[PDB]
Amino acid sequence: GAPGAPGSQGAPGLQGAPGAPGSQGAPGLQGAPGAPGSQGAPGLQGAPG
Amino acid sequence: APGSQGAPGLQGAPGAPG
């Protein structure tokens, strides 16, 4: 015989490269239903007459 | 607070002999 008969020559694995860094779920919402733009529950205020 | 409202009112009959 002679050298060079690697019994377990192999590269098992290497499966994963950098996965999701967070996936940015819930990324942008600004839900903000409403705003400035003052409202007055009353009416006819500062004026009647 | 409807802006108050139409309020057209004040003294009634100051009549009689006076």
PDB file of C-alpha atoms in Angstrom:
ATOM      1  CA  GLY A   1       0.000   0.000   0.000  1.00  0.00           C
ATOM      2  CA  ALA A   2       0.849   3.672   0.231  1.00  0.00           C
ATOM      3  CA  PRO A   3      -0.347   6.738   2.156  1.00  0.00           C
ATOM      4  CA  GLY A   4      -3.408   8.687   1.125  1.00  0.00           C
ATOM      5  CA  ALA A   5      -6.505   6.603   1.904  1.00  0.00           C
ATOM      6  CA  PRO A   6      -8.492   9.121   3.990  1.00  0.00           C
ATOM      7  CA  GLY A   7     -11.046   7.038   5.854  1.00  0.00           C
ATOM      8  CA  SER A   8     -13.262   9.955   6.907  1.00  0.00           C
ATOM      9  CA  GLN A   9     -12.266  12.599   4.356  1.00  0.00           C
ATOM     10  CA  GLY A  10     -15.312  14.836   4.531  1.00  0.00           C
ATOM     11  CA  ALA A  11     -16.685  18.334   4.922  1.00  0.00           C
ATOM     12  CA  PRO A  12     -19.881  17.685   6.909  1.00  0.00           C
ATOM     13  CA  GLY A  13     -21.799  20.818   7.779  1.00  0.00           C
ATOM     14  CA  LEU A  14     -21.200  24.402   6.634  1.00  0.00           C
ATOM     15  CA  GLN A  15     -24.987  24.678   6.563  1.00  0.00           C
ATOM     16  CA  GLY A  16     -25.683  28.135   7.948  1.00  0.00           C
ATOM     17  CA  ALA A  17     -24.546  31.591   6.928  1.00  0.00           C
ATOM     18  CA  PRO A  18     -25.582  34.712   8.861  1.00  0.00           C
ATOM     19  CA  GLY A  19     -29.309  34.255   9.321  1.00  0.00           C
ATOM     20  CA  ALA A  20     -31.911  36.921   9.976  1.00  0.00           C
ATOM     21  CA  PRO A  21     -30.379  39.875  11.877  1.00  0.00           C
ATOM     22  CA  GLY A  22     -33.851  40.507  13.310  1.00  0.00           C
ATOM     23  CA  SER A  23     -36.102  40.552  10.215  1.00  0.00           C
ATOM     24  CA  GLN A  24     -37.212  44.072  11.260  1.00  0.00           C
ATOM     25  CA  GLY A  25     -40.679  42.837  12.256  1.00  0.00           C
ATOM     26  CA  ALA A  26     -43.059  45.556  13.465  1.00  0.00           C
ATOM     27  CA  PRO A  27     -40.725  47.812  11.466  1.00  0.00           C
ATOM     28  CA  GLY A  28     -42.767  50.954  10.968  1.00  0.00           C
ATOM     29  CA  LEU A  29     -46.089  51.751  12.608  1.00  0.00           C
ATOM     30  CA  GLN A  30     -46.662  55.453  13.333  1.00  0.00           C
ATOM     31  CA  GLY A  31     -50.099  54.164  14.311  1.00  0.00           C
ATOM     32  CA  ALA A  32     -51.035  57.623  15.558  1.00  0.00           C
ATOM     33  CA  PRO A  33     -54.799  57.468  14.941  1.00  0.00           C
ATOM     34  CA  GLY A  34     -55.440  61.152  15.509  1.00  0.00           C
ATOM     35  CA  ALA A  35     -53.319  64.258  15.432  1.00  0.00           C
ATOM     36  CA  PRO A  36     -53.047  67.925  16.343  1.00  0.00           C
ATOM     37  CA  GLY A  37     -55.957  69.916  14.987  1.00  0.00           C
ATOM     38  CA  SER A  38     -57.699  71.040  18.157  1.00  0.00           C
ATOM     39  CA  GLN A  39     -61.387  70.202  18.517  1.00  0.00           C
ATOM     40  CA  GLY A  40     -63.948  71.729  20.830  1.00  0.00           C
ATOM     41  CA  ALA A  41     -66.659  69.521  22.260  1.00  0.00           C
ATOM     42  CA  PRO A  42     -68.888  72.648  22.330  1.00  0.00           C
ATOM     43  CA  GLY A  43     -70.223  74.654  19.444  1.00  0.00           C
ATOM     44  CA  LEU A  44     -70.999  78.296  18.735  1.00  0.00           C
ATOM     45  CA  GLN A  45     -68.373  79.301  21.303  1.00  0.00           C
ATOM     46  CA  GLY A  46     -66.877  82.778  21.444  1.00  0.00           C
ATOM     47  CA  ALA A  47     -69.558  84.382  19.289  1.00  0.00           C
ATOM     48  CA  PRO A  48     -73.192  83.809  20.411  1.00  0.00           C
ATOM     49  CA  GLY A  49     -75.146  87.006  19.815  1.00  0.00           C
TER      50      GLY A  49
ATOM     51  CA  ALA B   1     -71.860  74.454  25.250  1.00  0.00           C
ATOM     52  CA  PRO B   2     -73.804  74.892  21.998  1.00  0.00           C
ATOM     53  CA  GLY B   3     -72.335  78.362  22.009  1.00  0.00           C
ATOM     54  CA  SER B   4     -75.127  79.283  24.381  1.00  0.00           C
ATOM     55  CA  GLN B   5     -77.943  80.024  21.902  1.00  0.00           C
ATOM     56  CA  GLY B   6     -80.417  82.623  20.705  1.00  0.00           C
ATOM     57  CA  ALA B   7     -81.238  84.567  23.872  1.00  0.00           C
ATOM     58  CA  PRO B   8     -83.542  87.408  22.753  1.00  0.00           C
ATOM     59  CA  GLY B   9     -85.347  88.248  25.969  1.00  0.00           C
ATOM     60  CA  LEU B  10     -85.732  90.810  28.742  1.00  0.00           C
ATOM     61  CA  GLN B  11     -88.436  92.738  30.591  1.00  0.00           C
ATOM     62  CA  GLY B  12     -92.067  92.103  29.705  1.00  0.00           C
ATOM     63  CA  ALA B  13     -94.974  94.477  30.318  1.00  0.00           C
ATOM     64  CA  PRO B  14     -94.107  97.509  32.461  1.00  0.00           C
ATOM     65  CA  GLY B  15     -97.517  98.938  31.625  1.00  0.00           C
ATOM     66  CA  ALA B  16    -100.547  99.675  33.807  1.00  0.00           C
ATOM     67  CA  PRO B  17    -101.182 103.346  34.704  1.00  0.00           C
ATOM     68  CA  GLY B  18     -97.375 103.599  34.719  1.00  0.00           C
TER      69      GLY B  18
END
